[PDB]
């Protein structure tokens, strides 16, 4: 009749209230890591069963006609397998932060760099802290990094990584070929994929890879630099030049280190900036739904714990079942039409799932055509003026478009239970607590997210 | 072959890092609701297996003696059944707060009052808000209340509940015979049990039931009143007297409403204050482990979202499987002894589980006796001066007692998966992330927490 019943994990914040609930099963099928999909893949089979009024727990309310939950279908989708972490060994990341900030952002740092072969050195302020004890605290939890005390300030310690990079490579990590400046809130959706894409650049030539800010006035203010929030990559030959002229470039005031880095490369590096539009600085505040639901290639995120608030750790939970590259992938399904037999015009309805972010139900009215939304255009949902984001984020759609209704279910909870990942999307409607659960039926032993790469730093 | 393996629900904050892990099973056998238990019930069989080093996810690390997780036993523990919610109908609770604060505290309010027969009226500030919409917003989620607009200020709205109570009882709730003043952070561990205990009072006589602050200086400052945060109970005959002298008592400044209520009863009520020590105002800051792990009869809690921080919603999650009365119940187990065959002295260890709060491993040194801790004496763990709390909280013990080591695993996560509740206790040790999981195997259909009282407010 049905298709073992998996019980949803429910915190009391979700178990206690009454809720309108529906669930769908998605079965990830892993293909090549180099496989490519559409920005919005279609599912031509019914997906979301009708909602069921539930009471405390999962008890079916007596308001429902059917006394039971609907039988949800299993939707097979193709996902690109995770890339190998072998190419990550050539990377050495550098941070200017504190051990307290590393501990607060530990889960996000574990997803980005944990269970990879990349090295991390951190310039921390001067203190009485036991660096060996703090280093063991993070390494035993899965984050192998090197803590180095520095007398410089945070702004100077950022550029001070140039000297820290060179000495660490010369003395401890000679196999390093790529060096990377990062913020502690620079979140990599798939670091091994980035390491694989760095192979296209000659390792023996100088290279300066980064991204511009999405806000045009930030580029006007600070110049065409690699904004440090999105991540910066500097090849070893360019680092050798930066070390040669470190004393001539390093100021000791409050100039942003990423701007100082770009100006030093512009002056003595003879290396142009290589632009990676997949790295996102996120120089924007408010609702970031448009960028996350854009279907664009997103390899790094930023500002998610300051300028705006977004649990990127909760968002990447699905990677344990469907791989890293499945995060923020878009599927469209459940297209329904409600025609008026007198006028012939119809109100159309369809769903778009941004994996790990949102479930959006779109309603086109009688006067709204089918192509009213180009989902390859980025919806402008943030606060700043949209004119400064047209150049970087392409042609922007309006947040409030006439004739279009956008009901959004934001991801509230996510849990890994065995081989499955339970996604708990929630919309707080006036008529109740609306819940949409997506259970990803991942393969045995895990679908990725570094679950098999625990001994990859050994020996 | 272990004694159907239940996979633990893991958020990415717990799935990503490496961790030292252990789990024990607890099967609550439900007995009579009036059954009493010791403040520290013994478990005489081994409970906690040896710790297993786990990598990312639940992968058994090669840094382990055995390649598999141990088979943990199932501990049978007697728990008292939840009381009936019939006696809650006589209660009418009054709040002086806003719809925004009700929304932020909705889960805790749902556990306290949801799925009971008690009424709730709230005096909210004047605004253009659609009161009927907000009422439907909370009622559809499980919290039925009446929102009344009031021009009075906050302190006046609290005592203004005297008029709001009398009018609501006379016109909408005539069956109300107990009226209760509460804060929005007044948390009830078992409201039906409190409603049952209120039957011990003659319902036709004036009654003023409350609790004094634990800090003696707060009583010296504001008097021997029923402190509002712990919850105040006023019988209907006393409310009639309070309404007769409302104008003579109600001021218009910033006098605390609970002190104003007590002073009005003192001047016109002719009713002494009946002290309930089980209601705790929680007039303390810092680590509140001593009160929560005291084994004392705790029926109301307060200040858990302001003066101190404690997710009382996560704490009561186990009540879905072991009943409301199991929360904060204590069990001691795993008494181990490590003697020295030369001197004969021994180092002894044992565990004390405060259900839903903490797992503490005590270590007594060679010169510490077995009676070194009276677990009926409240450990002084909060910030303020201990002398001000000796009267209310009995003889206190020191947080740092010589020869006694206290390693505490605090409750980090809690989930209800079908008939089971998973408790995720966490201690952040210098050598790694330490996790002890307790899986409560509740009975079929849920162990309580109002899972069967969903249709109890029907007409
Ligand atoms: O790797 C980092 C990133 C930031 N910060 C500190 O955090 C502040 C805010 O940085 P955030 O990343 O939130 O915003 P940004 O400066 O990137 O716009 C900075 O001014 C620094 O003082 C730090 O110590 N280390
Ligand atoms: O039922 C309540 C309780 C508190 N507050 C607000 O919260 C403040 C204090 O919060 P809390 O109740 O945690 O502290 P307490 O007053 O109990 O010491 C009050 O001054 C009010 O502004 C409120 O609006 N409604
Ligand atoms: O080079 C500075 C650059 O990092 C800018 O500084 C701040 O304006 C904001 O962090 C970012 O846009
Ligand atoms: O009646 C006043 C009483 O509520 C006291 O006021 C504050 O000191 C704190 O809320 C509590 O101790
Ligand atoms: Mn940053
Ligand atoms: Mn309060």
Residue numbers in the entry:
A (entry chain A), B (entry chain B): 76 to 78, 81 to 536
From the paper:
UDP-α-D-galactofuranose (UDP-Galf): β-galactofuranoside β-(1→5)-galactofuranosyltransferase, known as GfsA, is essential in synthesizing β-(1→5)-galactofuranosyl oligosaccharides that are incorporated into the cell wall of pathogenic fungi. GfsA is an enzyme that transfers β-galactofuranose from UDP-α-D-galactofuranose to the 5ʹ-OH of β-galactofuranose. In addition to the typical GT-A fold domain, GfsA has a unique domain formed by the N and C termini. GfsA functions as an inverting enzyme, catalyzing the transfer of a Galf residue from UDP-α-Galf to the 5ʹ-OH of a β-galactofuranoside substrate, leading to the formation of a Galf-β-(1→5)-Galf product.
In this study, we present the crystal structure of GfsA-Mn2+-UDP and Galf, the β-Galf β-(1→5)-galactofuranosyltransferase from A. fumigatus. A diffraction dataset with a resolution of 2.46–2.37 Å was obtained for a crystal of GfsA–Mn2+–UDP and Galf complex. Para-nitrophenyl (pNP)-β-Galf was used in crystallization; however, the pNP group's electron density was unresolved. The complex of GfsA–Mn2+–UDP and Galf is dimeric, aligning well with the gel filtration chromatography findings. There were a domain with a GT-A fold domain (α-helical domain) that includes the central region (spanning residues 160–360) and a GfsA-specific domain (β-sandwich domain) that includes the N- and C-terminal regions (residues 76–159 and 361–535). The UDP, a product of the donor substrate, was coordinated with Mn2+ through interactions with the DXD motif (D260, D262, and H379). UDP interacted with W384, H380, and S383 regarding the phosphate group, while A173, R178, F231, I259, and D261 interacted with the uracil moiety. The acceptor substrate, Galf, was present within the depression and hydrogen bonded with D335 and D360. D360 precisely orients the acceptor substrate by forming a hydrogen bond with the 3ʹ-OH group of the acceptor Galf. In our study, the crystal structure revealed that the β-galactofuranoside had its 1ʹ-OH group oriented outward from the active site.
